[PDB]
């Protein structure tokens, strides 16, 4: 059949170890490639790149396998702004301090004070006289969930496929839809990604797929109707 | 005499085993490239705006089984827990949780395990013995009366698929599938890569 | 769940030798990447930071080099004048204070060297320019300020980075979660493509190398905070 | 203090064979770069790129060192347009050829014909009728300034120093300005120009630049408050 | 049998956050614009036109009345009217004469500087002051001149502001007209069309010179209807029912 | 032959997949357009080469008319036109009853009656006011102003829906006009364009202003012929033969 | 010298492809354009602009004329005309009664189909007969009603049809007018411009409106010639002369 | 109320960094236009709009007067005022009569040079003379020739340049217009509309052209407040103070 597709294509997983189908959902950009050539001959070398215009942050762990670990204890910065020096040339916090805090002046020479208790931090003449706007850095103590990256590993296998629809060009109706089988396809380790301004990210993805043991499939395509 | 094309090219598939004509009057380009190395400079391309499974298997190096049930993934959206109690999916799954969620006043989903009949195309490591022919057909337009009296004829004998096979599916744009070939020289005569203008004054 | 973003980060920057908490900005551009090399065995993960600040400081490129800046240090720059006019005389007069020898050039691209002279009245030969003619010069002149070089090798500090963002969710539009991203002492690098181009900002650009950590042995932590805490 | 800065360069080219200082700049964009090297990694060579929005044969001549001996006699094309063929098949040429003539017709033909002392050049019938009109390309000696390029005489150590003014970020005023000065500068020859339709060339000098033998020193920063 | 239309249509909105079916005005003119847009997709020799994925259809909406209102602005960005507002507006006082002791009385309630203009013109800001007589230099005019005054006074009404931002009120048109048979000289049918699902942009517009065809512009955009998916709506009405 | 036009031209439809010959009437306006595009600079020292691409050649039509027709919107937007199906449709009276008595009646037709209005600057909301012939509605006193009142009424007749339905139909066009000698001021011939195979666009644009006509405004697209590969015919003679 | 015009030129065209001459007849408004592309260059410090840089000159054409043929509408289609050729054409008949036995005799040459309305719109349709005479259904219409018919008849005539890929020929424009003396108003001198090597362009617009011609314009297009690098010379004559 | 307002808009300039008040003049005409721009993200399957945007606003304000004012061109750009300093400005003489000695008297001041144009558009050039009297040769004129000469005269007056590398400071606009009621023909109620923090554009244009004013224009462009984040305010006054 002569016929012809436009959109995108939806992707789905599949997991082997236990069971457990991740990606209740669609993504963005997905590609295909393949190049054989490396004249010991070559066999076959595949590429995926799926790309979806969101955020998770399972779909940056499946990277590199490591548990999603829960609310727990993590040092991260803070900073404050608006701070205005009294007459006694002293300054006090609104926030929690848990570490040494840097008070910045107006023509920018810094000032290192340890942690005061009663959260009101005097301020030297020579830093800052009164009146005189303040900003405060510090360490903080917030809890969340944690993640991070730990040298480089192999971890858990996990499958994918590509799932698109058809058009039938003369009578412009949904003739069949298009199923991309990979069998035996693990997470690839370089995720790479840019943060800008102004603009979406489009995390990229990458894994390769390993030839079936029993099949010898690793790159299937199935193209099924809609009238049966 | 001086002039300058404005149409794309036809292009014709003949196998040199039995030969099935496939043509088509509706392609992007018809490019082959030139280089020396060490010389190969039969390097082809062409670019269609159609999809087929014909070309695809032309690339790769095996049949399509038709009327068969493999495997295929699908999922729902709506309302599919609640009534407090437990869940019912509706669907054919082949491969219950009012906790660790919404005590069933939400829409959490679930994929589950279908299939259906459709193609089969299997894309292996073997297979490689196909010759073919190839041959290319454009106009060019006269610069001094705005007519087309000459049209341009490119074929390339002992052309071979290349193993080579680039596509990228996006957004609503475009898809523009792609084929290339790649042509040795010829046994008896030594040629390659021809090219021939017409005359309709004749 | 799922988010989106398009915002900048808040990258700070603390050296570890001692306690300086420097360098809290507004950037433009922000990213990490890693790759697979060879020699023998390739075990090998790099992290390269890259940060573009829509900011132009000596403080900010003084540590992808090493030594230190000189304050109030005394140099030569070259300066030049146009518009002067030549009397009837043959004879120029300038401004300036040259202590070198002052170049002068016509209409016609032609130079003619003058050794600077006290007295502020230079001759020209009347090939080179005749009577009522526009001449232009250039000289150098001594000047004062901040003055910064460049050497080879010698980098040896080592400096803790942290990347801020704010989650968005997209069915609310609104505050979801905060993407924070830690990292352990990283290496400047010997990297800098800055450019002064025509009517556009310059953005110059800083690159890192992320370590494993001596303890932790980490090289990049993703933290995640929501407005439920 | 932090500030901001957009705008090109004022450079200056001068040379160390006798001091010889020429050129103010009148450019589109500049740049300088390092990096690190491989093999003795320890290395930060410096590379220039700076494009001149106008066009000058001196810049092209101090990347090919050579002599720029002007008043040379040239053997040059020269190609006349829109002549007439008469029934006698005899025209003189308006212009003074020098070299082999050749007439094309409308079709496309060829016909080398030598000079003529009267100037007037026999016409075959065969290659037009007559009231046709041909087209002629010869030679045309002509004067002017020459440039030749070698395959040697690589000499030459420049010194080349940028200008540019800081605009302060709060004040709309310039200040400081800053000084990218960088002594002992060889050139390097890589230039890639293009003439084309509806775009300048802006040509593209390139240039290595070396430590000095007393300072060790290659690249320095120069910044001074407009103040003083 | 057919018909012709010369009259307008009565216009009606109705918002479909809450029951509110108001602005029963009369208007001088109404109109509507359907469009489509095409993409098409290239073939090949020339004959370029094979498949179109046509989609986005469209309906603008368009309308100006002959009264101005402060009510009829609050669909084009979503905000309320304050009342009994304090404001700070100018204003302007003519016919000041200067006395011999070169000093000028003021009849009103200033809150800010006063400037004072001479025949020519000359900026004289002073402070205001409780008398309500202020000296004037002598190099600023000379006695039995007549000057000019301005200055700013609060003022009290209902004032509106305007933001980028709270932009998701929809509302319901319905239109009016009367349609006249052509060979019986009386009306024969209401045609009323109707615009579900309405979401009012904006492309704020006014030029107020004179009295000529002030004419308020409000344009609304009409959005897909989510449970019969019609854009618009036409109906014929018959007088005999 | 020389000659001049300065008339009209009547319009002739016809469907492709049936035989009906609908509207053979008159209009004020009928036009048909042909639309080119392309051409590049191909510059180099400005010189200009052979500016042409050749394709498209796309052709337009625009038909106007001097009555309003409900078959003419439902055919360029071919759908089923709803004979017998019950609408909603709003209503105003003006004056029953003197308002020093907090009593109202209003007569006709009580299905929504609500939303009152105040007669200078307020509005006089009942909110909810659907009753049984209702004759107290208390509200606020507004003694001896207006009255005022707004309906909802229910009727019957014609129904029409515009939504993205794919069009598919295609059809005839005839033209037919009457030229003049331009020395003895009599009809040398008739004119007539054929647009075989020609389908329906979407664009649709009308006004209601003050006092004109509706001129309904549809547009088509002529396509070339699967046969002769035409899509514009003009052919004309004399009536003398 | 110094003078000026206030009349429309003539109009002048010759075929470039062997010899042909056409279209040397008055016309009512002409008209040519000059323009140039739009470039700029900046550099220095301050981005001050240092030069002004552009090129690419086109120049575009109009003429409009009183009169219409398809004569020169064949100049923007330029092939040959066929004459005397068998057309298919529309007819439209009234004035038809029934007599007394429910039949109705018919006039004229039906060819394809014959279609019958009644007085209040309904439609009838009916097989093509021989004789003429059709029994009209009794409840479409009773004895002594009046009818009206339409069908397809014949004829004979020139015919010019637009093929699906598009054509041009190059061609030759000649102007002439007439300028006037500055203080004796005679006519000084004739302008003449000339445009070598120039084609036209599609961009035909007929509207078939009442009370007035069309005046059907043609548009052209200029291109540089490749002989002497010229494409527009204007040319003022001498009355003395 | 349903209000209708009858008159122009008075213009109030206030300057951020000082207390000016200029150009408190009437002016002839007002207006301000609004529009809104946004754009979203693309998805999965039919490209359905993800629901995520960026929207930002703008408001163009326009401004019209039937006087000239020095300052008030000044206005645009941020350049003061220079006073009374000499310029060089050209200048024309008509009716010269050369003597028979081919020489002309001239009454003007010539700083630079004379040029003599004849009646035939011949140019002659000489330098100035001393004396005002001038040699022409006989080929130029003979003898009682009438003659025109152009130079250039010394000029003392105020100076202004406009300069395309200074701009600054920040301005604030209000309105005012009376409100007409529809029934007692009376002022009800009087409009202002104030833009806080609007920053002064340079898109200038006057037409100095035959016959009637000049109108100059100046566009503004609107930035929200950084502190109440407001670009415009609407106040709609009565007559109950």
């Known amino acids: 059949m002569k016929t012809v597709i436009q959109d995108t294509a939806d992707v789905y997983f599949k997991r082997k170890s236990d069971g457990k189908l991740v990606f209740t959902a669609e993504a963005q950009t997905a590609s295909f490639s ?8 070559s066999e076959k070398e595949i590429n995926l790149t799926v790309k979806n215009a969101f955020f998770d942050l399972e779909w940056l762990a499946m990277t590199q396998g490591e548990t999603i670990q829960e609310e727990t204890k993590v040092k991260v910065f803070d900073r404050e702004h608006g701070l205005i020096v009294d007459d006694t040339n002293k300054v006090t916090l609104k926030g929690k301090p ?5 008070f910045y002046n107006k023509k920018g020479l810094t000032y290192k004070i340890a ?3 009663d959260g009101t931090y005097t301020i030297p003449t020579a830093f800052a006289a009164a009146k005189d706007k303040l900003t405060a850095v510090y360490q903080i103590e917030k809890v969340g969930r944690r993640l991070a990256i730990k040298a480089s590993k192999f971890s858990e296998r996990y499958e994918v496929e590509y799932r698109t629809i058809a058009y039938n060009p003369d009578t412009e109706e949904v003739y069949s839809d298009i199923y ?3 069998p035996n396809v693990s997470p690839s380790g370089e995720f790479e990604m840019s943060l800008e301004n102004g603009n979406a990210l489009a995390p990229e993805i990458k894994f390769e797929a390993l030839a079936d043991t029993d099949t010898d499939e690793m790159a299937v395509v199935i193209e099924a109707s809609r009238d049966e």
């Open 34 to 41: 393949q190049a054989i050539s490396e004249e010991l001959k």
């Open 98 to 102: 848990v570490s040494d805090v840097t």
């Open 115 to 117: 942690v005061s208790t």
């Open 180 to 182: 991309i089988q990979f």
